[PDB]
Amino acid sequence: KLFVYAGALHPHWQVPQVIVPAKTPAEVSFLPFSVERADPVQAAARIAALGDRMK
Amino acid sequence: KFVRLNVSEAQRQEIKNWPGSVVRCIENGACIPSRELQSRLEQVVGVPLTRRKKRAGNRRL
Amino acid sequence: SGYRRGRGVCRDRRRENLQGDQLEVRAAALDAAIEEENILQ
Amino acid sequence: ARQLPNALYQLTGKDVLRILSSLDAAGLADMLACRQVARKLLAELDELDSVDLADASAVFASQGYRNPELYSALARRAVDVKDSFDAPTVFRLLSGFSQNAV
Amino acid sequence: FYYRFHKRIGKGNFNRYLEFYQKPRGIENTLRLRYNYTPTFTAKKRSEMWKVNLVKKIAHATDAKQVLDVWTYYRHRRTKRPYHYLLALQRLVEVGGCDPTDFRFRLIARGIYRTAKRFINLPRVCVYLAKLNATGDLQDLSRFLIPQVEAYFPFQLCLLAHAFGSVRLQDKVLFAAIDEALRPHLSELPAAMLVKLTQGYAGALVHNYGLLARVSLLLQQRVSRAARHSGPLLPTLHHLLAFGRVCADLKYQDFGYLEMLSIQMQAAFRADLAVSSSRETFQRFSPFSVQELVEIFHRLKVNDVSLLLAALRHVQARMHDYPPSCVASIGFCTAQMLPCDASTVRQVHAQMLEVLQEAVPLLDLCSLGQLAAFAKKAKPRRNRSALRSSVFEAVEARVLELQGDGRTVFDVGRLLELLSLNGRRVSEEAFHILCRQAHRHHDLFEPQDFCRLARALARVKCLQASSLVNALARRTLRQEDEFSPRDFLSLLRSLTLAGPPDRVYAVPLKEKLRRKQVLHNYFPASQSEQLLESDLPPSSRQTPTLRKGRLLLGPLEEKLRIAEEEGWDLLHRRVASLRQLKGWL
RNA sequence: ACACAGUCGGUACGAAGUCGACAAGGUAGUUGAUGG
RNA sequence: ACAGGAUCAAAUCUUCCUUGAGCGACUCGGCAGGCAAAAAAAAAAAAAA
RNA sequence: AUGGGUAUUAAUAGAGUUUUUAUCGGCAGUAUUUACGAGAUGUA
């Protein structure tokens, strides 16, 4: 009456699986993070300055 | 190597022209093989890779 | 209704026992009718 | 209503009138059914009764289907068998005429 | 006793094992579980109660899904019996059939084949299978049917023949054996059983005129004598018309039988007109019976002028009781058969056309096509062209309302040809709908249907349905032998003129036409290369080229989840997972 | 019989019926307990 | 079994889907063969009349 | 052919039949086996 298998899935026709397809995580009603945006002019200056130094 | 050495001359030329390794691209799902290439691959691996079509001689009157 | 059958089910309703336990944890004819009302309450 | 024509041959004038009146009470307006039923009513004039004529007049008036030939045939048959009419039946017969302006 | 059962190591290979999330081939324990201790009362009752519950739940099931689920649930319970199989089949037929390829039904079919020889009433199983459309299983069972036909009852043999005919499966050995077995019993069979036997032969298209002549003689003799488990020996007008339709299907032109039928039908029409109280009208026949008679005579090309005139007279007398579809079919057949210059024929046809144009909104595609053909084949007194123009306009208006009617069978080719004729141009929407629907009818097409559809497409172009032209070209290339020289030549001309098909069909078609012309020495007064691998369709991969891309080979919460993912039904079973344990702790 | 071959225990009827049976059902004589 | 099903419908020669693995595979179903006789190291070697 | 009375190839319900060696002597008598269905809810 015992059935053992090396792999994740078993071949029994009429018995449910324990390893099942994954489901998307449930949504939440709160934002875990806050965001604050830099001024566009300063951001443009910084991006331009970094651009040549990198590449 | 088996595919290259057993396939026809035109298919060999196509294999040579193809960039990279054909078997690796097929396994990665980057290139679609030809019917002859698939037939040689099936000969190598012992099983079909697409629904195998058998030819019957049946006709409705 | 499946448990209040007149002839008596051969088996007790263990599902009801467990569900009711969890629920409680987590939080002459007219006289006979009155007694039925009491057991209902 | 659209399947009635396939069964017209198994019915009588009374049966067809009953079906038409029930549909009218339900609230259906399909002039094709009335137009098809008119032919059977006119082909079976010799068997209609006073209540049948009154019902036909009323149902067609309510539906709005107008056919001078049909109304003239109904009037002629009603006059022919006037002996079997009553006051409410006569009023029912004449109400269709009044409503249809025939 | 000692229950010897061991699990062995085996010869697997799991070093550097990779997990593919694919099931293994089979369960490890396949040896029979033989209990070595006697069961208790409850244990034995649970073991044996399937014999009750299976039939009870089959009866309670009101759907093929439920029936198959119950059978699958009890799949492992032995030992199934012929009455179990028969109850399953009967319930399936009553609920309304199922896919005969569903693996759950394949269990039943394989079990039936396994226990075929143990069935007492194998013909009942065969009838159920024919009704369920299990053509393959029905075909296999003939092996065991053949050596038992002489032992069955004649009505069983008649039902067997009807069942085989219903699925249009030809088994000439079986039909010959059935005929030999029924030879001594034919005279005493009821009219309904004779009709069943002949209808089976007609459906199988076995042209046993030796049987047809005997049946016709028997029916004539029984009618002459004329003038609840078995059924009456004496036939009725319905049985006569059924046998006549069988004769039309098998192309049996029995003029004596048709004379008898014409006399009987004329007498019936006379009696129906004589009837007076409006309750006994159509007592012996119906408008559908009249339509069937007219169709019989049209199909057999037997021009019984008196009978056709009597039918038209009856239709005129009581047309208010004639269904519009019956009117359309009668008009079609009568106009195709008779001249429209006759006064009575012309008057009746005019009235029928009036009623049909009146009832166009009720007509289906078949009736619409028949009406279109009849309105043009008629010869009206007034407004000959305007009548046809209005009929065509109404048919176009009605066709758009039947866009999704993917079930009715009709002559798309003839409808398209009528719509595109005498310089008339078809409406784009109606033409698109008709050419879209023409794909269903290709398996039903004759050589003349091929020619007519190609003609219609060529005329309409001179709009083009490239897919339809390609399908026509492929099918005619496959069925080249079916065509006469002139038919093939005109068909190829029309195919080219309607927008040339793909070269893959154009070239071999020319080769076939060339061979046919040589063989038949046919060369009309008015009258290429070898195939290249580049002309082959790119959907296939017969060229050596390699392309970037992929070959995609893929196309009550617990109960719902298991049904959605695993794909089977728990039924009364219940499932839970460890995720919900704290609700019970 | 695994048994110096014995000893102590040892299956718990029917519904296998059905014109069945508090709060919801989406009508299955189906269902109520359970978010990190 | 190309057996059943879908489709603006398939190169001759099925574009796909179903057939839990079309019963492990292929067959048979008046199939199958224990004993005698006659032979016979394992085996093989006689159609019936 | 303003088109299907229309052109081509029904062996079609019947594709069916007992070989070779061999002058002369010898065997070939019996048993088992397939419906472990509720024919039937009998042909509507």
Side-chain angles (χ1 to χ4, degrees), chain E residues 248-268:
Chain E
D249 286 275
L250 287 170
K251 298 177 192 179
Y252 183 52
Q253 216 173 38
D254 198 316
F255 283 103
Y257 179 88
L258 297 163
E259 157 183 39
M260 184 260 284
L261 176 61
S262 179
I263 287 155
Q264 302 308 345
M265 287 305 305
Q266 287 181 57

PDB file of all heavy atoms in Angstrom, chain E residues 248-268:
ATOM      1  N   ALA E 248     -34.590   5.735 -54.870  1.00  0.00           N
ATOM      2  CA  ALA E 248     -33.934   6.908 -55.442  1.00  0.00           C
ATOM      3  C   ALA E 248     -32.466   6.968 -55.037  1.00  0.00           C
ATOM      4  O   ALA E 248     -31.599   7.287 -55.858  1.00  0.00           O
ATOM      5  CB  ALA E 248     -34.660   8.180 -55.006  1.00  0.00           C
ATOM      6  N   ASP E 249     -32.169   6.669 -53.771  1.00  0.00           N
ATOM      7  CA  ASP E 249     -30.782   6.684 -53.313  1.00  0.00           C
ATOM      8  C   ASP E 249     -29.948   5.638 -54.044  1.00  0.00           C
ATOM      9  O   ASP E 249     -28.795   5.897 -54.408  1.00  0.00           O
ATOM     10  CB  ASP E 249     -30.720   6.451 -51.803  1.00  0.00           C
ATOM     11  CG  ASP E 249     -31.158   7.662 -51.006  1.00  0.00           C
ATOM     12  OD1 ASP E 249     -30.316   8.551 -50.760  1.00  0.00           O
ATOM     13  OD2 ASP E 249     -32.340   7.725 -50.614  1.00  0.00           O
ATOM     14  N   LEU E 250     -30.509   4.453 -54.262  1.00  0.00           N
ATOM     15  CA  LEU E 250     -29.782   3.369 -54.913  1.00  0.00           C
ATOM     16  C   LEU E 250     -29.957   3.356 -56.428  1.00  0.00           C
ATOM     17  O   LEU E 250     -29.475   2.426 -57.082  1.00  0.00           O
ATOM     18  CB  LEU E 250     -30.219   2.023 -54.327  1.00  0.00           C
ATOM     19  CG  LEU E 250     -29.709   1.745 -52.908  1.00  0.00           C
ATOM     20  CD1 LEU E 250     -30.383   0.519 -52.314  1.00  0.00           C
ATOM     21  CD2 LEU E 250     -28.196   1.575 -52.903  1.00  0.00           C
ATOM     22  N   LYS E 251     -30.626   4.358 -56.998  1.00  0.00           N
ATOM     23  CA  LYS E 251     -30.829   4.455 -58.444  1.00  0.00           C
ATOM     24  C   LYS E 251     -31.526   3.211 -58.992  1.00  0.00           C
ATOM     25  O   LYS E 251     -31.119   2.634 -60.003  1.00  0.00           O
ATOM     26  CB  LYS E 251     -29.502   4.703 -59.166  1.00  0.00           C
ATOM     27  CG  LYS E 251     -28.831   6.011 -58.788  1.00  0.00           C
ATOM     28  CD  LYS E 251     -27.489   6.164 -59.481  1.00  0.00           C
ATOM     29  CE  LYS E 251     -26.694   7.315 -58.893  1.00  0.00           C
ATOM     30  NZ  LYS E 251     -25.366   7.458 -59.543  1.00  0.00           N
ATOM     31  N   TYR E 252     -32.592   2.796 -58.308  1.00  0.00           N
ATOM     32  CA  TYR E 252     -33.442   1.698 -58.757  1.00  0.00           C
ATOM     33  C   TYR E 252     -34.708   2.302 -59.352  1.00  0.00           C
ATOM     34  O   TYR E 252     -35.567   2.805 -58.622  1.00  0.00           O
ATOM     35  CB  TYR E 252     -33.772   0.752 -57.606  1.00  0.00           C
ATOM     36  CG  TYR E 252     -34.590  -0.454 -58.015  1.00  0.00           C
ATOM     37  CD1 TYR E 252     -34.193  -1.263 -59.073  1.00  0.00           C
ATOM     38  CD2 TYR E 252     -35.757  -0.786 -57.341  1.00  0.00           C
ATOM     39  CE1 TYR E 252     -34.936  -2.363 -59.447  1.00  0.00           C
ATOM     40  CE2 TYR E 252     -36.505  -1.886 -57.708  1.00  0.00           C
ATOM     41  CZ  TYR E 252     -36.091  -2.671 -58.762  1.00  0.00           C
ATOM     42  OH  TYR E 252     -36.834  -3.767 -59.132  1.00  0.00           O
ATOM     43  N   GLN E 253     -34.819   2.252 -60.676  1.00  0.00           N
ATOM     44  CA  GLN E 253     -35.935   2.856 -61.402  1.00  0.00           C
ATOM     45  C   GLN E 253     -36.943   1.750 -61.705  1.00  0.00           C
ATOM     46  O   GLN E 253     -36.893   1.107 -62.754  1.00  0.00           O
ATOM     47  CB  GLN E 253     -35.438   3.544 -62.667  1.00  0.00           C
ATOM     48  CG  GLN E 253     -36.179   4.819 -63.022  1.00  0.00           C
ATOM     49  CD  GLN E 253     -35.540   5.553 -64.184  1.00  0.00           C
ATOM     50  OE1 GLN E 253     -35.071   4.936 -65.138  1.00  0.00           O
ATOM     51  NE2 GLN E 253     -35.515   6.877 -64.105  1.00  0.00           N
ATOM     52  N   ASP E 254     -37.863   1.526 -60.766  1.00  0.00           N
ATOM     53  CA  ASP E 254     -38.906   0.510 -60.898  1.00  0.00           C
ATOM     54  C   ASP E 254     -40.186   1.205 -61.350  1.00  0.00           C
ATOM     55  O   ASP E 254     -40.920   1.775 -60.538  1.00  0.00           O
ATOM     56  CB  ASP E 254     -39.109  -0.234 -59.583  1.00  0.00           C
ATOM     57  CG  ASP E 254     -39.840  -1.551 -59.767  1.00  0.00           C
ATOM     58  OD1 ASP E 254     -40.832  -1.581 -60.522  1.00  0.00           O
ATOM     59  OD2 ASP E 254     -39.423  -2.554 -59.153  1.00  0.00           O
ATOM     60  N   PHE E 255     -40.458   1.141 -62.654  1.00  0.00           N
ATOM     61  CA  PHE E 255     -41.608   1.851 -63.197  1.00  0.00           C
ATOM     62  C   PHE E 255     -42.923   1.262 -62.703  1.00  0.00           C
ATOM     63  O   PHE E 255     -43.882   2.006 -62.491  1.00  0.00           O
ATOM     64  CB  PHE E 255     -41.554   1.847 -64.724  1.00  0.00           C
ATOM     65  CG  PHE E 255     -40.565   2.823 -65.292  1.00  0.00           C
ATOM     66  CD1 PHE E 255     -39.339   2.391 -65.767  1.00  0.00           C
ATOM     67  CD2 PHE E 255     -40.862   4.174 -65.352  1.00  0.00           C
ATOM     68  CE1 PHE E 255     -38.428   3.288 -66.289  1.00  0.00           C
ATOM     69  CE2 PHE E 255     -39.954   5.074 -65.872  1.00  0.00           C
ATOM     70  CZ  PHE E 255     -38.736   4.630 -66.342  1.00  0.00           C
ATOM     71  N   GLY E 256     -42.995  -0.055 -62.508  1.00  0.00           N
ATOM     72  CA  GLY E 256     -44.216  -0.640 -61.973  1.00  0.00           C
ATOM     73  C   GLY E 256     -44.512  -0.172 -60.559  1.00  0.00           C
ATOM     74  O   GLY E 256     -45.642   0.207 -60.233  1.00  0.00           O
ATOM     75  N   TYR E 257     -43.491  -0.189 -59.698  1.00  0.00           N
ATOM     76  CA  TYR E 257     -43.672   0.304 -58.338  1.00  0.00           C
ATOM     77  C   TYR E 257     -44.046   1.777 -58.340  1.00  0.00           C
ATOM     78  O   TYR E 257     -44.898   2.212 -57.557  1.00  0.00           O
ATOM     79  CB  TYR E 257     -42.402   0.080 -57.519  1.00  0.00           C
ATOM     80  CG  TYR E 257     -42.507   0.594 -56.103  1.00  0.00           C
ATOM     81  CD1 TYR E 257     -43.006  -0.208 -55.088  1.00  0.00           C
ATOM     82  CD2 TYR E 257     -42.118   1.887 -55.782  1.00  0.00           C
ATOM     83  CE1 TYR E 257     -43.109   0.259 -53.795  1.00  0.00           C
ATOM     84  CE2 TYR E 257     -42.218   2.364 -54.494  1.00  0.00           C
ATOM     85  CZ  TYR E 257     -42.715   1.546 -53.503  1.00  0.00           C
ATOM     86  OH  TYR E 257     -42.816   2.017 -52.215  1.00  0.00           O
ATOM     87  N   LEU E 258     -43.412   2.568 -59.208  1.00  0.00           N
ATOM     88  CA  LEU E 258     -43.743   3.986 -59.271  1.00  0.00           C
ATOM     89  C   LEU E 258     -45.156   4.211 -59.797  1.00  0.00           C
ATOM     90  O   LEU E 258     -45.826   5.153 -59.372  1.00  0.00           O
ATOM     91  CB  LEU E 258     -42.721   4.720 -60.134  1.00  0.00           C
ATOM     92  CG  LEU E 258     -41.297   4.678 -59.576  1.00  0.00           C
ATOM     93  CD1 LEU E 258     -40.300   5.040 -60.653  1.00  0.00           C
ATOM     94  CD2 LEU E 258     -41.163   5.611 -58.381  1.00  0.00           C
ATOM     95  N   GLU E 259     -45.625   3.363 -60.714  1.00  0.00           N
ATOM     96  CA  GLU E 259     -47.010   3.446 -61.167  1.00  0.00           C
ATOM     97  C   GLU E 259     -47.968   3.164 -60.018  1.00  0.00           C
ATOM     98  O   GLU E 259     -48.962   3.877 -59.825  1.00  0.00           O
ATOM     99  CB  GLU E 259     -47.232   2.464 -62.322  1.00  0.00           C
ATOM    100  CG  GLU E 259     -48.679   2.031 -62.542  1.00  0.00           C
ATOM    101  CD  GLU E 259     -48.819   1.014 -63.658  1.00  0.00           C
ATOM    102  OE1 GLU E 259     -47.946   0.129 -63.774  1.00  0.00           O
ATOM    103  OE2 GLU E 259     -49.804   1.099 -64.420  1.00  0.00           O
ATOM    104  N   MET E 260     -47.680   2.118 -59.240  1.00  0.00           N
ATOM    105  CA  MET E 260     -48.499   1.828 -58.067  1.00  0.00           C
ATOM    106  C   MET E 260     -48.529   3.023 -57.123  1.00  0.00           C
ATOM    107  O   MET E 260     -49.597   3.442 -56.658  1.00  0.00           O
ATOM    108  CB  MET E 260     -47.956   0.597 -57.342  1.00  0.00           C
ATOM    109  CG  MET E 260     -48.802   0.161 -56.159  1.00  0.00           C
ATOM    110  SD  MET E 260     -48.121   0.701 -54.580  1.00  0.00           S
ATOM    111  CE  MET E 260     -46.771  -0.451 -54.367  1.00  0.00           C
ATOM    112  N   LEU E 261     -47.354   3.586 -56.834  1.00  0.00           N
ATOM    113  CA  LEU E 261     -47.276   4.708 -55.906  1.00  0.00           C
ATOM    114  C   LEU E 261     -48.033   5.914 -56.441  1.00  0.00           C
ATOM    115  O   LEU E 261     -48.707   6.618 -55.683  1.00  0.00           O
ATOM    116  CB  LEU E 261     -45.813   5.061 -55.641  1.00  0.00           C
ATOM    117  CG  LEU E 261     -45.554   6.281 -54.754  1.00  0.00           C
ATOM    118  CD1 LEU E 261     -46.139   6.072 -53.367  1.00  0.00           C
ATOM    119  CD2 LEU E 261     -44.066   6.564 -54.669  1.00  0.00           C
ATOM    120  N   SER E 262     -47.925   6.177 -57.744  1.00  0.00           N
ATOM    121  CA  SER E 262     -48.646   7.295 -58.340  1.00  0.00           C
ATOM    122  C   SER E 262     -50.150   7.103 -58.221  1.00  0.00           C
ATOM    123  O   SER E 262     -50.878   8.046 -57.896  1.00  0.00           O
ATOM    124  CB  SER E 262     -48.243   7.451 -59.806  1.00  0.00           C
ATOM    125  OG  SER E 262     -48.953   8.512 -60.418  1.00  0.00           O
ATOM    126  N   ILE E 263     -50.635   5.888 -58.479  1.00  0.00           N
ATOM    127  CA  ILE E 263     -52.069   5.629 -58.369  1.00  0.00           C
ATOM    128  C   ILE E 263     -52.534   5.852 -56.935  1.00  0.00           C
ATOM    129  O   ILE E 263     -53.544   6.526 -56.683  1.00  0.00           O
ATOM    130  CB  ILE E 263     -52.390   4.205 -58.856  1.00  0.00           C
ATOM    131  CG1 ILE E 263     -52.280   4.128 -60.379  1.00  0.00           C
ATOM    132  CG2 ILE E 263     -53.781   3.786 -58.409  1.00  0.00           C
ATOM    133  CD1 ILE E 263     -51.977   2.739 -60.898  1.00  0.00           C
ATOM    134  N   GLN E 264     -51.792   5.300 -55.971  1.00  0.00           N
ATOM    135  CA  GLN E 264     -52.181   5.458 -54.572  1.00  0.00           C
ATOM    136  C   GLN E 264     -52.165   6.924 -54.157  1.00  0.00           C
ATOM    137  O   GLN E 264     -53.075   7.387 -53.460  1.00  0.00           O
ATOM    138  CB  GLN E 264     -51.259   4.641 -53.665  1.00  0.00           C
ATOM    139  CG  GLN E 264     -51.213   3.146 -53.962  1.00  0.00           C
ATOM    140  CD  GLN E 264     -52.582   2.498 -54.029  1.00  0.00           C
ATOM    141  OE1 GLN E 264     -53.579   3.070 -53.594  1.00  0.00           O
ATOM    142  NE2 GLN E 264     -52.633   1.289 -54.574  1.00  0.00           N
ATOM    143  N   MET E 265     -51.143   7.672 -54.575  1.00  0.00           N
ATOM    144  CA  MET E 265     -51.043   9.068 -54.170  1.00  0.00           C
ATOM    145  C   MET E 265     -52.129   9.913 -54.820  1.00  0.00           C
ATOM    146  O   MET E 265     -52.663  10.831 -54.190  1.00  0.00           O
ATOM    147  CB  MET E 265     -49.658   9.617 -54.512  1.00  0.00           C
ATOM    148  CG  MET E 265     -48.539   9.094 -53.615  1.00  0.00           C
ATOM    149  SD  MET E 265     -48.820   9.353 -51.849  1.00  0.00           S
ATOM    150  CE  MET E 265     -49.096  11.120 -51.792  1.00  0.00           C
ATOM    151  N   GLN E 266     -52.471   9.627 -56.078  1.00  0.00           N
ATOM    152  CA  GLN E 266     -53.569  10.347 -56.715  1.00  0.00           C
ATOM    153  C   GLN E 266     -54.884  10.076 -55.998  1.00  0.00           C
ATOM    154  O   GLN E 266     -55.678  10.997 -55.766  1.00  0.00           O
ATOM    155  CB  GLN E 266     -53.666   9.956 -58.190  1.00  0.00           C
ATOM    156  CG  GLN E 266     -52.556  10.539 -59.052  1.00  0.00           C
ATOM    157  CD  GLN E 266     -52.684  10.152 -60.511  1.00  0.00           C
ATOM    158  OE1 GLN E 266     -53.704  10.415 -61.147  1.00  0.00           O
ATOM    159  NE2 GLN E 266     -51.647   9.524 -61.051  1.00  0.00           N
ATOM    160  N   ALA E 267     -55.129   8.816 -55.627  1.00  0.00           N
ATOM    161  CA  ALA E 267     -56.330   8.507 -54.857  1.00  0.00           C
ATOM    162  C   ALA E 267     -56.329   9.242 -53.522  1.00  0.00           C
ATOM    163  O   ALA E 267     -57.365   9.758 -53.085  1.00  0.00           O
ATOM    164  CB  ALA E 267     -56.440   6.999 -54.640  1.00  0.00           C
ATOM    165  N   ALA E 268     -55.172   9.295 -52.857  1.00  0.00           N
ATOM    166  CA  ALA E 268     -55.083   9.994 -51.580  1.00  0.00           C
ATOM    167  C   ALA E 268     -55.365  11.482 -51.741  1.00  0.00           C
ATOM    168  O   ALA E 268     -56.063  12.080 -50.916  1.00  0.00           O
ATOM    169  CB  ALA E 268     -53.704   9.773 -50.960  1.00  0.00           C
TER     170      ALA E 268
END
